[PDB]
């Protein structure tokens, strides 16, 4: 019997800014962002949207009726958390309408949590394949304003529907994941930004594909050749090509042609995003299903999660044969062509805007599940 | 093939204060705390001291050097977390020396996080029998001086290996789960202490505790004659007894005494500890484990995990034949008896201080895993 992803989508802010803008802002070529980091439009979000908010609508867009009665665990990832106690899944939980007898939580890992999550819930299932679990991908990516880290930011959100016998992505058993303790990006409590060592990011990140690839290679004896597509958690787009590059030099002309060319289909959306941290390799996974032509029934996807901290792991998943058909395509290129524009100083002034959660208040914002209003620091979501 | 907890074993901090000398320091009838809730000795710790030195030392007590190469999930269950991205459970990782090839991330939501953490490793090695996982409960309870919640403050930490054919508890598979968007108990981010609605805290908890027993025994047909024991959260001992009391009012006169006999077995070590939210329930099980002389193997456990935000769930487990033979009872009382009892004066002086992370230092305590040094807001401990 198969078990894993029989509904995905993903949700991004209704505002987002051009990189060409960006640049001509920060006094730097004009091209620098499209060629160098390799990043086209960056998501926005202003302070009456949180993780709830994404989580909400992303979520809301694959559940039905009969899903809500038969999920009965919910689980977000995430590292932009708005509660120390309290999980922002018990929030989604209500807000979804999903049947009471569940169990709701959290898990943290920098930008890993989401794929702990799709595993346990994978296992879940297989153990219960009368039970679907939710897992959902969470995150804002903020680095400030005139920051090293500022054109990679993002913020969105990517749900998934867990069950047996998917309708789009059948898990395999072929898991390998990497545990070191190593401080490349990481938050202190009461740090409202992260605390980044580039050089040792960059590092990191790339020796932890090749880390788990390689492992991966000996466990199974599967080479590049055999994966039809690899979808990546990346920072930014040029991050993941690097990565790639640096494991596939010795594959032959057509080979690397091969597996860059679909790696280039699976960062079509991100080019328009941004980093979603725990969101960013299953955005990867949505773009090469609904943008890679030349996949078919039966392929198979590697999958490269990668947490900053760090915890990494590579699986793969199988094409199930009429997954073209349960998609989201249109709501996805509606939602990101309808966005508005912003110029750089509303912007600016979005981004410099905080929530004083100590502050009762009120905010106005037209998109469902935004926070409505703060009591007591309790937030309220308009739905 | 049977699946649960192997080993146990709980980790407190070299402190405490009596509960008498609270209440004369508050102008308290020391009843109010000894009888009222329940409590007797307070664990407390200095800023030297975090989840990680907890988890570390819990589950170095039950770690073999086999043990560290089977294992390939560590998870840490805490609502008392240092970091808002990177898990806690990377660091006890590193420090255990557990083989690189795991995964470890860590969970949250409220008291109920090492809960949902067991479960899931259940579900793995349920999957994967030749493998083992590291679930640590860790946690600081710290409401304020003077403070409602400052009579059933707690610190600690407990640390469970889970694996196929348990030597202490066979878990069951009629797990009762529960999820309910309550504000008795949160942490907004950048609350060094939670914001609390006793009365809604107290009601929730009671009538959480009910709806999933309901549910079980109409699941199962069990009821509290089946039930050799069981194991309550609980965030002081009278909380747990107002639960049972109200739900077993009418089995026998002879049932109840026998029911609450039991649970008063299950609070000893907790009335010298206080609260240790996600680790409570899972300290009340040590205490029966190594309390209460009349169980055996083959004897029902009984456990509820509750959740503040809030979220619950009931489950079963068996004694295993042997286990009194795989219990750290000298251990733990040598933990509890050895502590060094503080004056409120010292009490007070040890729990204002606060850790100015952003500040490099250099840190002294004799305890094992305790924070040596601040370097960069990056922790080092004392190995």
Request: proline share 3%; charged share 20%; glycine share 8%.
């Amino acid at each position: 019997m198969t078990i894993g992803i029989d509904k995905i989508s993903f949700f991004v802010p209704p505002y987002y800014i051009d990189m060409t803008a960006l640049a001509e802002a920060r006094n730097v070529d004009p091209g620098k962002f499209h060629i160098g980091i390799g990043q086209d439009q960056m998501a926005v979000n202003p302070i009456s949207q949180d993780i709830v908010t994404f989580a909400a609508n992303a979520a809301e867009a694959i559940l039905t009726k009969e899903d809500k009665e038969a999920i009965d665990m919910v689980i977000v990832g995430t590292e932009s958390s708005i509660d120390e106690s309290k999980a922002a899944a018990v929030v989604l939980h209500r807000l979804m309408g999903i049947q009471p007898f569940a169990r709701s939580f959290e898990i943290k890992e920098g930008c890993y949590g989401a794929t702990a999550g799709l595993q346990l819930a994978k296992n879940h299932v297989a153990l219960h394949p009368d039970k679907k679990v939710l897992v959902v991908a969470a995150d804002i990516a903020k680095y400030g304003l005139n920051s090293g880290g500022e054109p990679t930011q993002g913020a969105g959100a990517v749900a998934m529907l867990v069950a047996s016998e998917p309708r789009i992505l059948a898990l395999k058993e072929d898991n390998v994941m990497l545990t070191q303790d190593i401080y490349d990006f990481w938050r202190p409590t009461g740090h409202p930004y992260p605390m980044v060592d580039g050089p040792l990011s960059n590092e990191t990140y790339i020796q932890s594909f090749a880390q788990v690839w390689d492992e991966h290679k000996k466990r199974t004896g599967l080479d590049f050749a055999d994966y039809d597509a690899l979808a990546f958690h990346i920072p930014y787009t040029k991050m993941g090509k690097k990565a790639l590059l640096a494991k596939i030099s010795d594959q032959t002309e057509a080979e690397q042609e091969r597996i860059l060319a679909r790696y280039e289909e699976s960062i079509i959306y991100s080019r328009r995003v941004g980093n979603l941290y725990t969101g960013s390799l299953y955005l990867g996974l949505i773009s090469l299903l609904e943008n890679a032509t030349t996949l078919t029934a039966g392929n198979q996807i590697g999958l490269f999660s990668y947490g900053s901290g760090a915890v990494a792991e590579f699986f793969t998943g199988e094409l199930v044969a009429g997954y073209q058909n349960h998609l989201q395509k249109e709501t996805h290129l509606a939602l990101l062509d309808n966005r508005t524009e912003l110029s750089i100083a509303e912007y600016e002034a979005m981004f410099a805007e905080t929530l004083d959660t100590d502050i009762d208040q009120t905010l106005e914002d037209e998109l469902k599940y935004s926070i409505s209003a703060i009591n007591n620091t309790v937030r309220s979501y308009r739905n």
